[PDB]
Scaffold this motif. Sequence first.
Motif, PDB file in Angstrom:
ATOM      1  N   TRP A  10      24.984 160.282  35.694  1.00 12.82           N
ATOM      2  CA  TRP A  10      25.579 160.319  37.015  1.00 12.82           C
ATOM      3  C   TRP A  10      27.010 159.849  36.987  1.00 12.82           C
ATOM      4  O   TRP A  10      27.855 160.409  37.678  1.00 12.82           O
ATOM      5  N   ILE A  17      34.492 164.549  38.628  1.00 16.57           N
ATOM      6  CA  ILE A  17      34.957 164.817  39.975  1.00 16.57           C
ATOM      7  C   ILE A  17      36.373 164.327  40.160  1.00 16.57           C
ATOM      8  O   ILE A  17      37.178 165.030  40.759  1.00 16.57           O
ATOM      9  N   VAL A  20      38.777 166.735  38.327  1.00 19.95           N
ATOM     10  CA  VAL A  20      38.822 167.942  39.131  1.00 19.95           C
ATOM     11  C   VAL A  20      39.725 167.748  40.326  1.00 19.95           C
ATOM     12  O   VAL A  20      40.510 168.637  40.643  1.00 19.95           O
ATOM     13  N   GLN A  23      43.261 167.922  39.292  1.00 22.88           N
ATOM     14  CA  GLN A  23      43.620 169.229  38.780  1.00 22.88           C
ATOM     15  C   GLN A  23      44.088 170.254  39.802  1.00 22.88           C
ATOM     16  O   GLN A  23      45.033 170.994  39.537  1.00 22.88           O
ATOM     17  N   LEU A 157      38.243 153.803  35.897  1.00 22.63           N
ATOM     18  CA  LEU A 157      38.857 154.801  35.054  1.00 22.63           C
ATOM     19  C   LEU A 157      40.095 155.406  35.662  1.00 22.63           C
ATOM     20  O   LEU A 157      41.054 155.653  34.938  1.00 22.63           O
ATOM     21  N   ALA A 160      42.635 152.951  35.104  1.00 20.59           N
ATOM     22  CA  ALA A 160      42.955 152.973  33.688  1.00 20.59           C
ATOM     23  C   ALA A 160      43.957 154.044  33.341  1.00 20.59           C
ATOM     24  O   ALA A 160      44.878 153.803  32.564  1.00 20.59           O
ATOM     25  N   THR A 161      43.807 155.247  33.946  1.00 14.63           N
ATOM     26  CA  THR A 161      44.741 156.353  33.879  1.00 14.63           C
ATOM     27  C   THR A 161      46.064 155.972  34.500  1.00 14.63           C
ATOM     28  O   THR A 161      47.114 156.383  34.021  1.00 14.63           O
ATOM     29  N   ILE A 163      47.585 153.009  34.652  1.00 16.80           N
ATOM     30  CA  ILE A 163      48.342 152.297  33.643  1.00 16.80           C
ATOM     31  C   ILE A 163      48.792 153.146  32.468  1.00 16.80           C
ATOM     32  O   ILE A 163      49.951 153.050  32.071  1.00 16.80           O
ATOM     33  N   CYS A 164      47.896 153.993  31.888  1.00 13.32           N
ATOM     34  CA  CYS A 164      48.113 154.416  30.511  1.00 13.32           C
ATOM     35  C   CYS A 164      48.345 155.889  30.326  1.00 13.32           C
ATOM     36  O   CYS A 164      48.965 156.299  29.345  1.00 13.32           O
ATOM     37  N   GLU A 165      47.883 156.719  31.284  1.00  7.22           N
ATOM     38  CA  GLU A 165      48.093 158.148  31.318  1.00  7.22           C
ATOM     39  C   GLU A 165      49.515 158.445  31.695  1.00  7.22           C
ATOM     40  O   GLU A 165      50.111 159.408  31.227  1.00  7.22           O
ATOM     41  N   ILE A 430      41.399 146.363  34.157  1.00  2.00           N
ATOM     42  CA  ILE A 430      40.940 147.078  32.986  1.00  2.00           C
ATOM     43  C   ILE A 430      40.063 146.247  32.075  1.00  2.00           C
ATOM     44  O   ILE A 430      39.024 146.729  31.626  1.00  2.00           O
ATOM     45  N   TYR A 431      40.448 144.970  31.800  1.00  2.00           N
ATOM     46  CA  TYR A 431      39.701 144.131  30.883  1.00  2.00           C
ATOM     47  C   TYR A 431      38.313 143.793  31.356  1.00  2.00           C
ATOM     48  O   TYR A 431      37.356 143.861  30.590  1.00  2.00           O
ATOM     49  N   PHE A 434      35.769 146.798  31.412  1.00  2.00           N
ATOM     50  CA  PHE A 434      35.395 147.174  30.066  1.00  2.00           C
ATOM     51  C   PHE A 434      34.357 146.218  29.519  1.00  2.00           C
ATOM     52  O   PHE A 434      33.377 146.651  28.918  1.00  2.00           O
TER      53      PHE A 434
ATOM     54  N   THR C  34      40.649 146.588  24.326  1.00  2.00           N
ATOM     55  CA  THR C  34      41.590 147.117  25.290  1.00  2.00           C
ATOM     56  C   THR C  34      42.364 148.289  24.728  1.00  2.00           C
ATOM     57  O   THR C  34      42.565 149.285  25.418  1.00  2.00           O
ATOM     58  N   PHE C  38      42.878 152.227  26.059  1.00  2.00           N
ATOM     59  CA  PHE C  38      44.193 152.758  26.354  1.00  2.00           C
ATOM     60  C   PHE C  38      44.381 154.101  25.692  1.00  2.00           C
ATOM     61  O   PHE C  38      44.945 155.018  26.290  1.00  2.00           O
ATOM     62  N   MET C  41      42.912 157.476  27.309  1.00  2.00           N
ATOM     63  CA  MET C  41      43.720 157.933  28.419  1.00  2.00           C
ATOM     64  C   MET C  41      44.875 158.783  27.958  1.00  2.00           C
ATOM     65  O   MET C  41      45.216 159.773  28.602  1.00  2.00           O
ATOM     66  N   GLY C  42      45.499 158.392  26.820  1.00  2.00           N
ATOM     67  CA  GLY C  42      46.652 159.030  26.228  1.00  2.00           C
ATOM     68  C   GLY C  42      46.383 160.454  25.824  1.00  2.00           C
ATOM     69  O   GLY C  42      47.241 161.319  25.994  1.00  2.00           O
ATOM     70  N   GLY C  45      46.329 162.972  28.742  1.00  2.00           N
ATOM     71  CA  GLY C  45      47.656 163.204  29.257  1.00  2.00           C
ATOM     72  C   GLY C  45      48.331 164.410  28.665  1.00  2.00           C
ATOM     73  O   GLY C  45      49.015 165.137  29.384  1.00  2.00           O
TER      74      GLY C  45
END
Lengths: 452, 36, 62
Positions: A10, A17, A20, A23, A157, A160-161, A163-165, A430-431, A434, C34, C38, C41-42, C45
Amino acid sequence: KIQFKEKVLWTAITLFIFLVCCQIPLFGIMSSDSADPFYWMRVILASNRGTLMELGISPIVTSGLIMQLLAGAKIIEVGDTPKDRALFNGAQKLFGMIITIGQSIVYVMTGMYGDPSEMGAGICLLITIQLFVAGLIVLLLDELLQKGYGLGSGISLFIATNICETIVWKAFSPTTVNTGRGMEFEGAIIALFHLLATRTDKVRALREAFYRQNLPNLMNLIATIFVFAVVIYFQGFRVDLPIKSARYRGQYNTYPIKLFYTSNIPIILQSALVSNLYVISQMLSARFSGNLLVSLLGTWSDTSSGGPARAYPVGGLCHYLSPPESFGSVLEDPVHAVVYIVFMLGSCAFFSKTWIEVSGSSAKDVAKQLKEQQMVMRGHRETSMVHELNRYIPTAAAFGGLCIGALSVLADFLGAIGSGTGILLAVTIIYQYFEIFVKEQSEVGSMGALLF
Amino acid sequence: EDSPGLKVGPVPVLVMSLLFIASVFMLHIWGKYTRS
Amino acid sequence: FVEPSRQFVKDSIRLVKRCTKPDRKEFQKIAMATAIGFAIMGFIGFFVKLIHIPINNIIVGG
């Protein structure tokens, strides 16, 4: 049907989602105005555009607020009889449902800036409805989750994106130059890998100081590592005692006690709720009932300065709310900086106990747990006769969030985090998630669980 | 609550999501798509 | 706030004395956990925009 095996599957759908949702806005743009305040919009859902969530992370606390405010008043105050809603949720659906579509409508219904001529003649049925659909799907799922679940990090998540995406997106999107990277005045080939290769030959231009000030994001990213170190440190602290489970003798099964770290999570929730304040203050002054000389008087500040003319409430209400964001310390103006530190410290502390305390922290809650699985009551006291785990939870908890809620607010003045307070809060998310996620899996590892 | 009972999913159920994706391409460029 | 102040100072000495650090080895372990997160995610992208953006006009191809 319940079953941990079903629950993980799930969670995978929930993540899908979100991907999507991002996107669709990338392929088309609408571009009658974005609307939601630019920094605030990013904190909820820094991605898409057009159909960012308006429900998660801050309307969530609105609905629950009634509990906090009345309890903290001590006497409940001159508030109308809270009761209502028949008895039990269903009202919870009603709130977040309206607040999605409601945010897009209110932006032209009332002030802000977006000249209405009705909601839209055409503008709303395309835009508004698309904004509504993304928020509606996520709420329905969230309410369903709040009925017999307690796992999954769909929500985490997206943070998380954020910060890091974003770091990789900026790196692998330009052709212009870009704010991120190079430090080059124009064209001069800018990619993260390309820059490291050239820089090796001569200097690097970043063995710290203040550099030239702001410039690329990357100067901040090196600085990030120092803030990273303190947040990880505070995770470590625990006070233990789960001892003597499943017998007595000696051997046992550990329970981690979250201690300080759980306490911070209400502050992160609080910081978003506090942020909103400017829109409401503006509404009270100009565009509420009749021009009272108290509603006006309290707020205002919007007469002068900075060149907007309309003046938002960036004159003074914002100044109390948030820092100037200047690179060094106290800065040019003491007053603006000083008020912000005081303002947050009290609010953070009051919040830090409360949501977590209701949801399962206290010795009464823990008492119900311990009968089921047996710690075996751990060489305690007859009747608990001057209570260990009861006394030390309020004292620990209040302090626990105080440190983190202090640190983010001070860190804005410090250069190191890229866009002040919001980033230090966002990293902390994030920490904790996780660490939590691994516990639900259990399965001695920390490894995969992607669709497993 | 709601008079419809189906909340959960498990294959052809998220019809609202399916409708949502289709509309967008019409509105503007990213692949050089037509602007409505 | 002068009420919670009193409580806080008593706590502030106490926590540090009670609790040891992330015990040297486990500084690396928490940081590492951590770092893997990270990295995931990269990867996402590049798929979303490295491929997609030169479709409209070629700037590096994709």
